[PDB]
GROMACS .gro file of C-alpha atoms in nm:
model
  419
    1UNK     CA    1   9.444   8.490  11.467
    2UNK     CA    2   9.460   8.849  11.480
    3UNK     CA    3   9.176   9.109  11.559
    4UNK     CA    4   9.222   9.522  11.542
    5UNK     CA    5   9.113   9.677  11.859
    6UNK     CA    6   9.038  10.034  11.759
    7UNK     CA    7   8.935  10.362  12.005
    8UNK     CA    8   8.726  10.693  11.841
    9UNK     CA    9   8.713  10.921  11.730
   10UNK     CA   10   9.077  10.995  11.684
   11UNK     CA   11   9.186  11.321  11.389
   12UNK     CA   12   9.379  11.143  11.133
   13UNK     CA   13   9.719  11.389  11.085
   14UNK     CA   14  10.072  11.424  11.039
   15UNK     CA   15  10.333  11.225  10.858
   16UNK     CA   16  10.346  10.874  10.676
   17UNK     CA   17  10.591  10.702  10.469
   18UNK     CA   18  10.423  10.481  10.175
   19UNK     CA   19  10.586  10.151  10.146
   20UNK     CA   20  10.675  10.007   9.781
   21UNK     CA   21  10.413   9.878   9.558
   22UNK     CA   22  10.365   9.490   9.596
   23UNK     CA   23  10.197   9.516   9.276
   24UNK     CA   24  10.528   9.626   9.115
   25UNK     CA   25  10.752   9.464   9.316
   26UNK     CA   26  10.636   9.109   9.231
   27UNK     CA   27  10.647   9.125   8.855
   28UNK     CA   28  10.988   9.230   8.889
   29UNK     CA   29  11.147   9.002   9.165
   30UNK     CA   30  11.014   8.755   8.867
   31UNK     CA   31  11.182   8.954   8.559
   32UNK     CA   32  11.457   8.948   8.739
   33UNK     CA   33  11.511   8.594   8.618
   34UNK     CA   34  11.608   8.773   8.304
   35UNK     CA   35  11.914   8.903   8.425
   36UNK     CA   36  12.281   8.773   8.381
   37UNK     CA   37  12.437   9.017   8.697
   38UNK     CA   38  12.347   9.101   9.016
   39UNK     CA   39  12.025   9.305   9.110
   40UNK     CA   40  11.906   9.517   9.447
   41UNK     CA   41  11.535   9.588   9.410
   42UNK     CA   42  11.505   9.862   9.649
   43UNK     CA   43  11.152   9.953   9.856
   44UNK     CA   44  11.039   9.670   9.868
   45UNK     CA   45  10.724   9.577  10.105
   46UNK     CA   46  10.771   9.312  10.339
   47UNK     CA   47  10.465   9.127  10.267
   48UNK     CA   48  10.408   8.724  10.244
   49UNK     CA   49  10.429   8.727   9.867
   50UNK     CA   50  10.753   8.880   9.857
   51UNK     CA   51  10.846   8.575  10.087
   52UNK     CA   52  10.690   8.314   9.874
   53UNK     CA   53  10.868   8.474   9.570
   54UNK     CA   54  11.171   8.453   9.710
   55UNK     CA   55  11.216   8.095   9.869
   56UNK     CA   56  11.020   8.012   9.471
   57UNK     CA   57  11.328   8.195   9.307
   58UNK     CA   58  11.565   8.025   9.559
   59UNK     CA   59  11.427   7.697   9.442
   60UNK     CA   60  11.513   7.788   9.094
   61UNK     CA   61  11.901   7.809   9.219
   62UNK     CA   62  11.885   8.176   9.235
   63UNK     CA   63  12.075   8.323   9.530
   64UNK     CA   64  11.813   8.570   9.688
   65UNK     CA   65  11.879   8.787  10.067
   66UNK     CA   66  11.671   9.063  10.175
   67UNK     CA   67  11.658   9.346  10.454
   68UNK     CA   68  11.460   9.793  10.254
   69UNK     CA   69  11.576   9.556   9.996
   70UNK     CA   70  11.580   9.239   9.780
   71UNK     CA   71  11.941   9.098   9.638
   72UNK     CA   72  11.838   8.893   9.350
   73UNK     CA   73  12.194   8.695   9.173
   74UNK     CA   74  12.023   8.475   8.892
   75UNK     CA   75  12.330   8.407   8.696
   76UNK     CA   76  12.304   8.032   8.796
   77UNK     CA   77  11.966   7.954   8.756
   78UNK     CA   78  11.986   7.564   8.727
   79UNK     CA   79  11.623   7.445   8.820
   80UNK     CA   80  11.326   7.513   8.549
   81UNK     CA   81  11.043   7.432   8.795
   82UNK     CA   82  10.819   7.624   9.028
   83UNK     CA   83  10.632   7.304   9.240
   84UNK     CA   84  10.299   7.311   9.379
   85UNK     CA   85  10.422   7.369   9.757
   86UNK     CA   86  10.589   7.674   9.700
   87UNK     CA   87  10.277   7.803   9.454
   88UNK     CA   88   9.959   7.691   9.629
   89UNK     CA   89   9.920   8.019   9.776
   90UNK     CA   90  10.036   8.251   9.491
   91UNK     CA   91   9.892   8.315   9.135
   92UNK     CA   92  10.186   8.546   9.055
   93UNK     CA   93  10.402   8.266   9.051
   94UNK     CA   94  10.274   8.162   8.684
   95UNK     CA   95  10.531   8.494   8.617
   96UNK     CA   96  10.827   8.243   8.644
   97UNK     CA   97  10.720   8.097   8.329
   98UNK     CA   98  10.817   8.356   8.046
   99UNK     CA   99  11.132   8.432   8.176
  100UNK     CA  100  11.258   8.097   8.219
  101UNK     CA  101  11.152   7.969   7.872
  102UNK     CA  102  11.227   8.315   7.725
  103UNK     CA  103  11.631   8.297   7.830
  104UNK     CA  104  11.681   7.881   7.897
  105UNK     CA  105  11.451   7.753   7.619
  106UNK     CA  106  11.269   7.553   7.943
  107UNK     CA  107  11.035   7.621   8.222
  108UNK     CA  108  10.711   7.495   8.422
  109UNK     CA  109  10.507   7.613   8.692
  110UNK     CA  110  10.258   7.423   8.890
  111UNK     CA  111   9.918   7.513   8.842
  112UNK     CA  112   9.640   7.416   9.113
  113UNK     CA  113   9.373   7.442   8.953
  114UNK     CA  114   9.026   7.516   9.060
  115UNK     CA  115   8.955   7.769   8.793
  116UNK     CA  116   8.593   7.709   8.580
  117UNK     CA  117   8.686   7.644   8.225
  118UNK     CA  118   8.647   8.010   8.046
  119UNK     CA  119   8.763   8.194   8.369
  120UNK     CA  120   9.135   8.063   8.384
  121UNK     CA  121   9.329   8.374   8.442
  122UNK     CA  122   9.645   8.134   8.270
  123UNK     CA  123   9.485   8.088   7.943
  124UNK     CA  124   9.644   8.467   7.819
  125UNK     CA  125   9.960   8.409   7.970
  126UNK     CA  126   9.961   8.032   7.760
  127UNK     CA  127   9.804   8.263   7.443
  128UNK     CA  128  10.089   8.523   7.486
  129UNK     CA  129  10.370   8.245   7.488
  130UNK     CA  130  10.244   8.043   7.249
  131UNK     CA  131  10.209   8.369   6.987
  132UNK     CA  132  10.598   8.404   7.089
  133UNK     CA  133  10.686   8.065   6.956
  134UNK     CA  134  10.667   7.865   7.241
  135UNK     CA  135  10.515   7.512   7.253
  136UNK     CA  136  10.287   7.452   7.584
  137UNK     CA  137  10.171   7.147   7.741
  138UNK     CA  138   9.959   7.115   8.022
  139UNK     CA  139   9.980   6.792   8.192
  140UNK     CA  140  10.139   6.661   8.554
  141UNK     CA  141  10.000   6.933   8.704
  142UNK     CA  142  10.183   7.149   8.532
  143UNK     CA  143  10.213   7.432   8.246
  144UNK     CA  144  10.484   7.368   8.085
  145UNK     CA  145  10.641   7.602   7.801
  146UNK     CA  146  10.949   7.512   7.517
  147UNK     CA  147  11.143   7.643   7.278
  148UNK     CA  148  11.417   7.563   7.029
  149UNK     CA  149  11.612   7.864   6.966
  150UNK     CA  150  11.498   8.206   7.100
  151UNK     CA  151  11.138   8.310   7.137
  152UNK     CA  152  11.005   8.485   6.823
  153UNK     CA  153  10.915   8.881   6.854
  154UNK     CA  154  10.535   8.861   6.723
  155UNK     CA  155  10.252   9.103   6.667
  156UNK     CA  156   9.994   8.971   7.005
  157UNK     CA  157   9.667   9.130   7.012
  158UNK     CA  158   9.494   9.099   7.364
  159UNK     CA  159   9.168   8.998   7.349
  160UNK     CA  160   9.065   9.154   7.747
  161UNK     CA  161   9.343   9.374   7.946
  162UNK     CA  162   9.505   9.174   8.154
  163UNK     CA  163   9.769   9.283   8.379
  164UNK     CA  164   9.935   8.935   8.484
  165UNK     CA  165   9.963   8.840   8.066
  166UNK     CA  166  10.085   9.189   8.003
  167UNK     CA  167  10.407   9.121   8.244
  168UNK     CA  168  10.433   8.744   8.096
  169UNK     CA  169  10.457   8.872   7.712
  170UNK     CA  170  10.642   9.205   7.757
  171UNK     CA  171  10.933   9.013   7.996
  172UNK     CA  172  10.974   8.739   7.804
  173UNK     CA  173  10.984   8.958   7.469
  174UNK     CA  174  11.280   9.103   7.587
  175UNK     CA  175  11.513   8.811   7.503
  176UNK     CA  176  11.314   8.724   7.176
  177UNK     CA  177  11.438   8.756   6.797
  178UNK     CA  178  11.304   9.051   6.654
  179UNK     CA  179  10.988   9.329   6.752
  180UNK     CA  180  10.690   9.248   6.931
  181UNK     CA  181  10.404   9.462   6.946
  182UNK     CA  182  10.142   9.433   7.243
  183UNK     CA  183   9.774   9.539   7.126
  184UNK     CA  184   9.524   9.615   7.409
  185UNK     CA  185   9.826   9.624   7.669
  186UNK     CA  186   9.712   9.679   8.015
  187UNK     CA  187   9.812  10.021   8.129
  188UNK     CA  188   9.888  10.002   8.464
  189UNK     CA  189  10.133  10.199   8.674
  190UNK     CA  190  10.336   9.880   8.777
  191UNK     CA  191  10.345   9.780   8.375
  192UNK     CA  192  10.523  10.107   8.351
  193UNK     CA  193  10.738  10.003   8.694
  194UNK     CA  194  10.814   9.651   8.539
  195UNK     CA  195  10.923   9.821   8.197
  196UNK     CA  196  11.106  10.037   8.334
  197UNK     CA  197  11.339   9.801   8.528
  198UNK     CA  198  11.342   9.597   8.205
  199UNK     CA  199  11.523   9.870   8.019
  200UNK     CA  200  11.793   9.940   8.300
  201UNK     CA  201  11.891   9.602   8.242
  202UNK     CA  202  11.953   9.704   7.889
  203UNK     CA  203  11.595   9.595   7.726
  204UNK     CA  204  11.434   9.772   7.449
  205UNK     CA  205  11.069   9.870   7.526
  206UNK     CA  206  10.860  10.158   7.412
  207UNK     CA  207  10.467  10.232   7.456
  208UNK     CA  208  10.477  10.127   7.856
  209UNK     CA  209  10.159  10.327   7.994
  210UNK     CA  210   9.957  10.365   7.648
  211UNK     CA  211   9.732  10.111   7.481
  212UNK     CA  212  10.053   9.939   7.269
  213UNK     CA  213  10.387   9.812   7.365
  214UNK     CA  214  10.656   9.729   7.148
  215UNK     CA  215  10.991   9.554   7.259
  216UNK     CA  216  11.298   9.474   7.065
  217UNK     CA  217  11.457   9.128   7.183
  218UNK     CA  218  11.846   9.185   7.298
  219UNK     CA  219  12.118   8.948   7.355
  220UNK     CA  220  12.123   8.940   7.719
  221UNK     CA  221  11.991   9.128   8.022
  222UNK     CA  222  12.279   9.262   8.270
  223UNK     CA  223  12.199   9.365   8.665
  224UNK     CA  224  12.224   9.712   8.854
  225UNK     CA  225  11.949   9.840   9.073
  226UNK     CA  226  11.644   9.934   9.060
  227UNK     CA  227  11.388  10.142   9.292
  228UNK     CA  228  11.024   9.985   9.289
  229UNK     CA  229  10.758  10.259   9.276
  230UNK     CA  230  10.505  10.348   9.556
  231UNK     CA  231  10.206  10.186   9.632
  232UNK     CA  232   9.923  10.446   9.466
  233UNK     CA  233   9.670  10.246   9.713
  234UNK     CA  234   9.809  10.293  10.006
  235UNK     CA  235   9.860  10.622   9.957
  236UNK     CA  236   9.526  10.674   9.869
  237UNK     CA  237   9.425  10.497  10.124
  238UNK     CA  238   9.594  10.748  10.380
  239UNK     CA  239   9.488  11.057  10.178
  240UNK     CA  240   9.122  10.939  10.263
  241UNK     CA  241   9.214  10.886  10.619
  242UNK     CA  242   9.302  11.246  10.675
  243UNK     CA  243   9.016  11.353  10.419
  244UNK     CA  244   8.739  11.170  10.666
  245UNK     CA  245   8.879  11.299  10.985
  246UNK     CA  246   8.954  11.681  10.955
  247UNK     CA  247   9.311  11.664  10.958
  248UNK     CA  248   9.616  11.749  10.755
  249UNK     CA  249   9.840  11.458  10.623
  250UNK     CA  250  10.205  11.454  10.411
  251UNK     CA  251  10.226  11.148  10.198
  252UNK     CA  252  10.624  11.045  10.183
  253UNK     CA  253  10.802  10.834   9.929
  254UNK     CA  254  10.510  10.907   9.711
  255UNK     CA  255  10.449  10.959   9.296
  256UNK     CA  256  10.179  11.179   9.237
  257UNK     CA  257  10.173  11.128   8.883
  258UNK     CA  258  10.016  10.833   8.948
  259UNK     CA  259   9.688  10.905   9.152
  260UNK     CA  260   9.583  11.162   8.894
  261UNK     CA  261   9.213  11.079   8.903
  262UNK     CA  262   9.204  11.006   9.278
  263UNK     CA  263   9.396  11.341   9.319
  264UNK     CA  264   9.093  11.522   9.150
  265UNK     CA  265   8.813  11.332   9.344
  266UNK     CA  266   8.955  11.430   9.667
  267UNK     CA  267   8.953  11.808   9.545
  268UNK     CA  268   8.592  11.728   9.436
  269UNK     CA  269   8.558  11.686   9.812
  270UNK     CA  270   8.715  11.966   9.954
  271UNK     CA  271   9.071  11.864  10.002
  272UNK     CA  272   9.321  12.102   9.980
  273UNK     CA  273   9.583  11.925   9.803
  274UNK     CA  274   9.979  12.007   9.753
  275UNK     CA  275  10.215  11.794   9.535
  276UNK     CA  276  10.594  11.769   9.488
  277UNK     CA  277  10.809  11.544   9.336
  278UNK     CA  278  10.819  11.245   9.560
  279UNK     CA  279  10.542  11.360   9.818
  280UNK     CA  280  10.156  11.468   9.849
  281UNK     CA  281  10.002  11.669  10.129
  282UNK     CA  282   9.627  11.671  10.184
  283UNK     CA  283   9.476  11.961  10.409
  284UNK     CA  284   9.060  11.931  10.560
  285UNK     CA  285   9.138  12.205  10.749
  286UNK     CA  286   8.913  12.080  11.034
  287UNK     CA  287   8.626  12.026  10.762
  288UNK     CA  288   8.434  11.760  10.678
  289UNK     CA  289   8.398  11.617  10.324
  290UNK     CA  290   8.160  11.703  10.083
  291UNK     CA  291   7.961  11.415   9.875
  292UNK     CA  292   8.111  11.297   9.552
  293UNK     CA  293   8.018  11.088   9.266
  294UNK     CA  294   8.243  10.837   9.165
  295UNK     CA  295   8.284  10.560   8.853
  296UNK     CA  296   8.533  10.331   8.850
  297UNK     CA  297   8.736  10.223   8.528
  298UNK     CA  298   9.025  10.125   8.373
  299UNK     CA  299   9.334  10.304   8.476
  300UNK     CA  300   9.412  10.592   8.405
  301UNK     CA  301   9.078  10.697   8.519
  302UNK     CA  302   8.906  10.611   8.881
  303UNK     CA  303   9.072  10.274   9.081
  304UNK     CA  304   8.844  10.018   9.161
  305UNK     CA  305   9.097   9.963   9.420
  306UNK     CA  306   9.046  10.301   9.611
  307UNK     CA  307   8.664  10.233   9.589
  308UNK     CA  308   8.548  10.130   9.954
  309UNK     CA  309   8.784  10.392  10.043
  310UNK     CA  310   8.529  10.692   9.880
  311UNK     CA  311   8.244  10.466  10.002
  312UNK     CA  312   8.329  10.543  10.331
  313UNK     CA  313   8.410  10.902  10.249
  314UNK     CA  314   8.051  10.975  10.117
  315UNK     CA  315   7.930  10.806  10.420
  316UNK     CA  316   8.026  11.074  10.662
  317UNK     CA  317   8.045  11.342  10.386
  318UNK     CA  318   7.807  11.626  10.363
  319UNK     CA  319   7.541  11.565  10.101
  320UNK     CA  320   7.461  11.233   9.851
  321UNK     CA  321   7.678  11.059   9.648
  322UNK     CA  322   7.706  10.730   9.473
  323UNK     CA  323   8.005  10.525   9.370
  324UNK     CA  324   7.967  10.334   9.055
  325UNK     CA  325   8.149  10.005   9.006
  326UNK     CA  326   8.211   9.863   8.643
  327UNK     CA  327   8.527   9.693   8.676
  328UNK     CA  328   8.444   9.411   8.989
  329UNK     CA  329   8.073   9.318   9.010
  330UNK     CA  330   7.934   9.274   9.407
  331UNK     CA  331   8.230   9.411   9.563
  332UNK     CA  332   7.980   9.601   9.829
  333UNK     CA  333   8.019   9.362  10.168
  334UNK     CA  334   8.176   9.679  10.304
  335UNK     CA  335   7.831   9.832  10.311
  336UNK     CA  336   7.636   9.641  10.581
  337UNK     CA  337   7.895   9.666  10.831
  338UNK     CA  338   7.936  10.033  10.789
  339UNK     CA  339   7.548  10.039  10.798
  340UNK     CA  340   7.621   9.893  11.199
  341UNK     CA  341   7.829  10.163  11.236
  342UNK     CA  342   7.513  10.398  11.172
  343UNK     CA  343   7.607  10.473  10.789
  344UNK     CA  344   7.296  10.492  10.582
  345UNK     CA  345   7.340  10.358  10.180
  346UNK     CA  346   7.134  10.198   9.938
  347UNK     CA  347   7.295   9.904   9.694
  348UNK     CA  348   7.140   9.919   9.391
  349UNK     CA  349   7.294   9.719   9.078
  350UNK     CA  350   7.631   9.819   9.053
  351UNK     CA  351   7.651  10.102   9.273
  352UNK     CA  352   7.604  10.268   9.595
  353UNK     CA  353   7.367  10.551   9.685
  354UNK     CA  354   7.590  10.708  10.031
  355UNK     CA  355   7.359  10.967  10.271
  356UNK     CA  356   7.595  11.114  10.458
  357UNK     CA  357   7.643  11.095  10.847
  358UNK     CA  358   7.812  11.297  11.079
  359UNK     CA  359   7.937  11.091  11.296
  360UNK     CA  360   7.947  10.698  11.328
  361UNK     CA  361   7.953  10.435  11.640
  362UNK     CA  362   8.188  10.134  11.699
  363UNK     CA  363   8.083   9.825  11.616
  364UNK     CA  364   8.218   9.473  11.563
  365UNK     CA  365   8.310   9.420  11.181
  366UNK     CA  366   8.454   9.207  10.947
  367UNK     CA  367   8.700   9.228  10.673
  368UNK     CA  368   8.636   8.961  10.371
  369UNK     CA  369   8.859   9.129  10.159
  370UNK     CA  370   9.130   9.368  10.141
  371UNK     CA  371   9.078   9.760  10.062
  372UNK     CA  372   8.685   9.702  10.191
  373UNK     CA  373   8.890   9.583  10.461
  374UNK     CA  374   9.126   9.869  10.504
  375UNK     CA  375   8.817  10.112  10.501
  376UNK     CA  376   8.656   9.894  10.819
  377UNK     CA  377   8.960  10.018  11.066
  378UNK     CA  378   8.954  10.376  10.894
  379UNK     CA  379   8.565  10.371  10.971
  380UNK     CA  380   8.686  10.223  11.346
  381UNK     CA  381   8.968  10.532  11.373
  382UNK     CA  382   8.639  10.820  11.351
  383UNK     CA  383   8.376  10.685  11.508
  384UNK     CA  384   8.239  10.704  11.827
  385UNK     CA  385   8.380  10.417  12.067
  386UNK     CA  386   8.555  10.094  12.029
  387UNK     CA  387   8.531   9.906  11.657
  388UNK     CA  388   8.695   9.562  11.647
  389UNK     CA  389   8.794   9.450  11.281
  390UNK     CA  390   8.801   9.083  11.254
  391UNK     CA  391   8.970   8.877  10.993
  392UNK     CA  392   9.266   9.112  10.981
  393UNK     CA  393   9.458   8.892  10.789
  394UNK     CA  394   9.328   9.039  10.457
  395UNK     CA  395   9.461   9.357  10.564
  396UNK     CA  396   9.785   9.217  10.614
  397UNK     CA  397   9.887   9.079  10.301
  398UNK     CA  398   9.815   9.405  10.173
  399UNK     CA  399   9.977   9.654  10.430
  400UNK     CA  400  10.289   9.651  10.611
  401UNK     CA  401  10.167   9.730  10.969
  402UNK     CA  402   9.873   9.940  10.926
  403UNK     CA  403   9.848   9.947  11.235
  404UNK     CA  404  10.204  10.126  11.313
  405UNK     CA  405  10.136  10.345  11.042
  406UNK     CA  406   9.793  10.433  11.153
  407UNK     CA  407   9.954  10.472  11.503
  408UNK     CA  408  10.212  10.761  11.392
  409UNK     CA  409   9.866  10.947  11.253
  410UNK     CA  410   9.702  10.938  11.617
  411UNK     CA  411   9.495  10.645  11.543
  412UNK     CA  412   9.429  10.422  11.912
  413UNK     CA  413   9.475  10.117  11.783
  414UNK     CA  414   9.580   9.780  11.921
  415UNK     CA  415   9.662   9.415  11.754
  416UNK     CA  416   9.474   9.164  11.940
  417UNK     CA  417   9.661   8.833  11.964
  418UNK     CA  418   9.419   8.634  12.169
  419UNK     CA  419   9.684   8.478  12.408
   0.00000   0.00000   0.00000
């Protein structure tokens, strides 16, 4: 069990090369069950999802390789079932179900359970497929969907914006008879990603990004390849690392377009930011942040995902701040072990009051979830001393090799193995 060693305070600066967006690359390793030719999926993260997806699609008889990227052949699917010990450690692999009922009439995914009645994440997915003519049963274990014919193109409207039954409706839509519209459709920049890939297979979809997307059923999907876009986190993620320790960072293999409001926070701080076509620079200019105020909600505006990030940037800003969270209620563990570190923050309600610090001190922390997680070795990386980040694991299935990445910055950091 893994442990990050980490050495302050270290300038954050140079060069790094965002990896794909697992976020984007799952829903469409799974769409590509749609398609009747050969696909490469190109940047793709190498991440343990992307490995559970593909021995899952394997299972289904699809012939799957990988490297930068995946080689997905589905045109002999012969297996309709995604079983519990290829699942157990996924959610995302209820997105199996819509494509294979959508183009073989048949499919079933294991569910595990655990869920309290009223906060089953599968009940829009079942509400999407049934509104698209499919009959669902739940029993064995199992959801399992069926239909005679095609799917019918329906008018769904979403009750709450949900991401996961977004992808389910709008993939399996694309091999229904006739138009359906999606009201309430979670905006997303991977919905636009997954879309995207959908229509250079030869689908029909319209609206990807805005509140309503409508698809026109086709035939048949074909193959080709497709380029998964870049993870908006992790770039984020490094754009606070250089705005937290003075220095001047490039961004690579990045889309600007979709970091908008996290763009104009940063400048809210003081960053001197630069943006091209496929890259981002941020410039401190040996400065030290200035205190912002920050809400989170649905996307396009603020990412609850970049959150603990700007926590920790108000910590060691100049001034007050507070970060406001209305998407993910308690999501502030973060905050007493940055408190060790010598931050000083009040948790009141659903937000954060940050007093700014110059610098902090190493301490030994502990990630309990991901991008609080992430912000624990940034904190480590600037302040005074040695931090240790236990529980790295989180970290992990989120970022390909922080630490290398982190590394390339000038970060003194070290994976602890305990052997």
């Amino acid at each position: 069990m893994d442990k990050f060693r980490v050495q302050g305070p270290t300038r954050l600066q140079g060069e790094v090369t965002i990896s794909g967006a697992k976020n984007a690359a799952l829903p469409i390793l799974f769409a590509a069950l749609l398609a009747e030719e050969p696909v490469e999926i190109q940047n793709v993260p190498k991440l343990k999802d992307i490995d559970t997806t593909m021995k899952l699609l394997t299972q289904l008889g699809t012939k799957v390789e990988r490297x930068g990227s995946v080689w997905i052949d589905a045109s002999n699917v012969n297996n309709f079932s995604a079983p519990y010990d290829l699942v157990k450690t996924m959610r995302a692999s209820i997105w199996a179900l819509g494509p294979l009922v959508a183009r073989f009439g048949q499919g079933q995914v294991s569910l595990p359970g655990g869920d309290a009645i009223g906060a089953a994440p599968v009940d829009l997915h079942i509400f999407g497929l049934e509104k698209l003519g499919a009959e669902i049963k739940l029993e064995e274990g199992y959801v399992k969907a069926s239909v005679n014919g095609r799917l019918k193109g329906a008018h769904i409207v979403m009750d709450k914006v949900s991401v996961g039954a977004t992808v389910t409706i709008m993939s399996a839509a694309t091999l229904a008879e006739g138009t359906t519209i999606i009201e309430n459709a979670a905006r997303e920049p991977e919905i636009v990603d997954t879309a995207n890939f959908l229509v250079a297979l030869g689908a029909k979809i319209s609206g990807q990004g805005t509140d309503r997307i409508t698809i026109e059923g086709v035939e048949r999907l074909g193959g080709g390849v497709y380029r998964v876009l870049p993870d908006r986190i992790e770039t984020g993620t490094f754009l606070v690392a250089a705005a937290i320790s003075g220095g001047k960072i490039v961004c690579r293999n990045a889309q600007p377009d979709t970091l908008d409001a996290v763009l104009a926070k940063l400048r809210e701080a003081g960053a001197d930011i630069e943006t091209g076509e496929d890259w981002i620079s941020l410039d401190m200019h040996g400065k030290r942040p200035k205190a912002v105020t920050v809400r989170t909600a649905p996307h396009p505006a603020f990412p609850t995902d970049m959150q603990a990030q700007f926590t920790l940037l108000n910590l060691v800003a100049e001034g007050t701040g507070v970060i406001t969270e209305t998407i993910f209620e308690n999501a502030f563990m973060h905050v007493p072990e940055l408190i060790r570190m010598g931050a000083h923050a009040e948790i009141e309600s659903n937000t954060v009051i940050c007093h700014g610090v110059e610098k902090l001190s190493g301490a030994q922390v502990m990630a309990t979830k991901l991008r609080a997680s992430a912000s624990l070795v940034l904190a480590g990386c600037i302040a005074e001393g040695t931090t240790v980040v236990d529980r790295i694991y989180h970290i992990d299935r989120g970022y390909e090799r922080i630490e290398d990445k982190l590394r390339a910055l000038g970060a003194n950091i070290e994976r602890v193995k305990g052997e």
